[PDB]
Write an enzyme that holds these catalytic residues in place. Structure first.
Site, PDB file in Angstrom:
ATOM      1  N   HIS B 117      17.955  -2.119  18.363  1.00 29.77           N
ATOM      2  CA  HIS B 117      17.839  -1.871  19.796  1.00 29.77           C
ATOM      3  C   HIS B 117      18.229  -3.126  20.586  1.00 29.77           C
ATOM      4  O   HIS B 117      19.090  -3.077  21.469  1.00 29.77           O
ATOM      5  CB  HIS B 117      16.388  -1.470  20.121  1.00 29.77           C
ATOM      6  CG  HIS B 117      16.078  -1.384  21.588  1.00 29.77           C
ATOM      7  ND1 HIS B 117      15.621  -0.243  22.213  1.00 29.77           N
ATOM      8  CD2 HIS B 117      16.120  -2.340  22.554  1.00 29.77           C
ATOM      9  CE1 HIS B 117      15.403  -0.534  23.504  1.00 29.77           C
ATOM     10  NE2 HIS B 117      15.693  -1.796  23.763  1.00 29.77           N
ATOM     11  N   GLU B 118      17.575  -4.241  20.271  1.00 28.79           N
ATOM     12  CA  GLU B 118      17.820  -5.506  20.955  1.00 28.79           C
ATOM     13  C   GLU B 118      19.225  -6.046  20.752  1.00 28.79           C
ATOM     14  O   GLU B 118      19.819  -6.617  21.672  1.00 28.79           O
ATOM     15  CB  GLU B 118      16.783  -6.546  20.529  1.00 28.79           C
ATOM     16  CG  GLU B 118      15.347  -6.168  20.905  1.00 28.79           C
ATOM     17  CD  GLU B 118      15.183  -5.845  22.384  1.00 28.79           C
ATOM     18  OE1 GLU B 118      15.879  -6.449  23.225  1.00 28.79           O
ATOM     19  OE2 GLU B 118      14.341  -4.989  22.714  1.00 28.79           O
ATOM     20  N   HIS B 121      21.916  -4.766  23.027  1.00 26.87           N
ATOM     21  CA  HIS B 121      21.836  -5.324  24.376  1.00 26.87           C
ATOM     22  C   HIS B 121      22.789  -6.499  24.588  1.00 26.87           C
ATOM     23  O   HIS B 121      23.235  -6.746  25.714  1.00 26.87           O
ATOM     24  CB  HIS B 121      20.415  -5.800  24.687  1.00 26.87           C
ATOM     25  CG  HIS B 121      19.493  -4.717  25.147  1.00 26.87           C
ATOM     26  ND1 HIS B 121      19.869  -3.680  25.972  1.00 26.87           N
ATOM     27  CD2 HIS B 121      18.170  -4.535  24.903  1.00 26.87           C
ATOM     28  CE1 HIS B 121      18.787  -2.921  26.197  1.00 26.87           C
ATOM     29  NE2 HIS B 121      17.734  -3.402  25.568  1.00 26.87           N
ATOM     30  N   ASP B 130      18.750  -0.168  29.333  1.00 34.19           N
ATOM     31  CA  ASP B 130      17.576   0.629  29.020  1.00 34.19           C
ATOM     32  C   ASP B 130      17.411   1.732  30.066  1.00 34.19           C
ATOM     33  O   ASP B 130      16.520   1.670  30.915  1.00 34.19           O
ATOM     34  CB  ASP B 130      16.315  -0.245  28.946  1.00 34.19           C
ATOM     35  CG  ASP B 130      16.256  -1.094  27.682  1.00 34.19           C
ATOM     36  OD1 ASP B 130      16.503  -0.553  26.586  1.00 34.19           O
ATOM     37  OD2 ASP B 130      15.955  -2.302  27.780  1.00 34.19           O
ATOM     38  N   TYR B 133      13.643   5.236  27.621  1.00 34.75           N
ATOM     39  CA  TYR B 133      12.768   4.649  26.609  1.00 34.75           C
ATOM     40  C   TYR B 133      11.991   5.740  25.859  1.00 34.75           C
ATOM     41  O   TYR B 133      11.431   6.651  26.476  1.00 34.75           O
ATOM     42  CB  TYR B 133      11.794   3.679  27.290  1.00 34.75           C
ATOM     43  CG  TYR B 133      10.887   2.909  26.354  1.00 34.75           C
ATOM     44  CD1 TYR B 133      11.332   1.751  25.716  1.00 34.75           C
ATOM     45  CD2 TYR B 133       9.573   3.321  26.130  1.00 34.75           C
ATOM     46  CE1 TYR B 133      10.491   1.021  24.878  1.00 34.75           C
ATOM     47  CE2 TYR B 133       8.724   2.599  25.294  1.00 34.75           C
ATOM     48  CZ  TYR B 133       9.188   1.452  24.673  1.00 34.75           C
ATOM     49  OH  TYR B 133       8.353   0.736  23.847  1.00 34.75           O
TER      50      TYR B 133
HETATM   51 ZN   LIG Z   1      15.866  -2.571  25.572  1.00 31.77          ZN
END
Ligand SMILES: [Zn+2]
Ligand SMILES: *[C@H]1O[C@H](CO)[C@@H](O)[C@H](O)[C@@H]1O
Ligand SMILES: *[C@H]1O[C@H](CO)[C@@H](O)[C@H](O)[C@@H]1O
Ligand SMILES: [Zn+2]
Lengths: 167, 167
Positions: B117-118, B121, B130, B133
Site C-alpha cells: 500500500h505504502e 504511494h 487514498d 480506505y
Molecule cells: Zn495510503
C-alpha cells in the site's frame, strides 16, 4: 443531397436532420455545463467519471460540427423492418430503410434520434458500436458496462432524445 | 536501515518486506499474463480496458524493481490507531506506527500488504492516492470509478493480498 428519395421522404429527412442537429446541440451544451453526476447522464452513460464524460463530450462536440442537413441521404432501401445504416469509414452518408418512414420525427426511436445514432457510428464522430439495442439493453449496458455504454450508438440516441425526460 | 527499531521489530520487518516483495512479484506476473477481464482484476481495478491495465501493470513493474528489504524503516511512531505512512516524494522510507505491529505478516490488511500500500504511494511507483480506505470502499471505488481505483493505494494492497483468493 438525396439519392432515390421521393418528395415526401426529402421533406421528412429535412425535418429529421434539423431536429437531429438540435438534439446534438442541446446534448453538447448539457455535457459542457454538467460536470457531475445527473440522472440523465448516469441512466445512459453509467457512473460519472471525468474520462467517460470527456469521451461523450468529444462525440457530441464532433457531431455538433456536422451539418446533418448536408448529409448524403439514400432512400433506395425498402426493408420494412430496418431504420437506417451507415459505413463508419464513409462519412456523411446515411442509408434509410422502410422502418425509418414509420418512425415519428422526434421522440423515442425517432427519425431525428436515428440520425444521431447513425452519426455517432462515423469514425470522425467517435466510431460508436452497437453493443446493445433498445432502451432496456441500453440502460442495462450503462449500469453493467459503462465503458461500452459511452461507445454504444443507442445510448447516445437515448441520451439525446431524453424521453422520458430527465434533468 | 532501521531508525528506532528493536531487534524484534527489525526481524519482523525483514519478514514483512520479504513477503511484500513476493506479493508485488506475483501481482506483476499476474498482470503480465492476464490481458483480459478476470474476477481478481475487476474486483479491485474495475472494468477492464487496456489503458487502465497498462497503468497498474506499470505500478507493479516499478514496485517489483523496488527492494523492500533495503527500505529505511522508522519505528519511532507509536500511534496505535494507524499502520504506517510515507512521503510520496521521499522514496524508500516508511514510518511504522503502533497498529502495524498488531497486524499479521501476511493476509488481509497485513504487514506485507501495508508495505505494498505504502510503496504504491511513492511517486516513483506511480503516486497512488487514498481515495478510498478499507475493502468495502475499495471495491465500491472499483465499481464506481475505475480510474481512481487504479490510482488508489488500498486497491493495490487488496489486489496483491488477494484474500479471499480469486482467479
Ligand atoms: Zn495510503
Ligand atoms: C443514474 O444513476 C445515478 C446513481 O448513481 C442517478 O444519479 C440517476 O438517478 C441514474 O439512475
Ligand atoms: C469484477 O466484475 C466482473 C463483472 O464485470 C466479474 O467478472 C468479477 O467477478 C468481479 O466482480
Ligand atoms: Zn447502430
Amino acid at each position: 443531397t438525396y439519392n432515390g428519395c421521393s418528395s415526401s421522404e426529402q421533406s421528412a429527412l429535412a425535418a429529421a436532420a434539423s431536429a437531429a442537429q438540435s438534439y446534438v446541440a442541446e446534448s453538447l451544451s448539457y455535457l459542457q455545463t454538467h460536470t457531475a453526476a445527473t440522472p440523465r447522464y448516469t441512466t445512459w452513460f453509467g457512473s460519472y467519471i471525468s474520462s467517460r464524460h470527456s469521451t461523450v463530450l468529444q462525440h457530441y462536440t464532433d457531431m455538433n460540427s456536422n451539418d446533418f442537413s448536408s448529409y448524403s441521404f439514400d432512400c433506395t432501401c425498402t426493408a420494412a423492418g430496418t431504420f437506417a445504416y451507415v459505413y463508419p469509414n464513409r462519412f456523411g452518408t446515411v442509408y434509410l430503410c422502410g422502418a425509418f418512414w414509420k418512425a415519428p420525427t422526434t421522440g423515442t426511436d425517432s427519425q431525428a434520434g436515428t440520425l444521431v445514432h447513425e452519426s455517432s457510428h462515423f469514425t470522425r464522430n467517435g466510431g460508436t458500436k452497437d453493443y446493445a439495442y433498445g432502451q432496456a439493453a441500453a440502460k442495462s449496458l450503462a449500469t453493467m458496462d459503462p465503458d461500452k455504454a459511452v461507445m454504444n450508438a443507442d445510448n447516445h440516441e437515448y441520451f439525446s432524445e431524453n424521453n422520458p425526460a430527465q434533468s
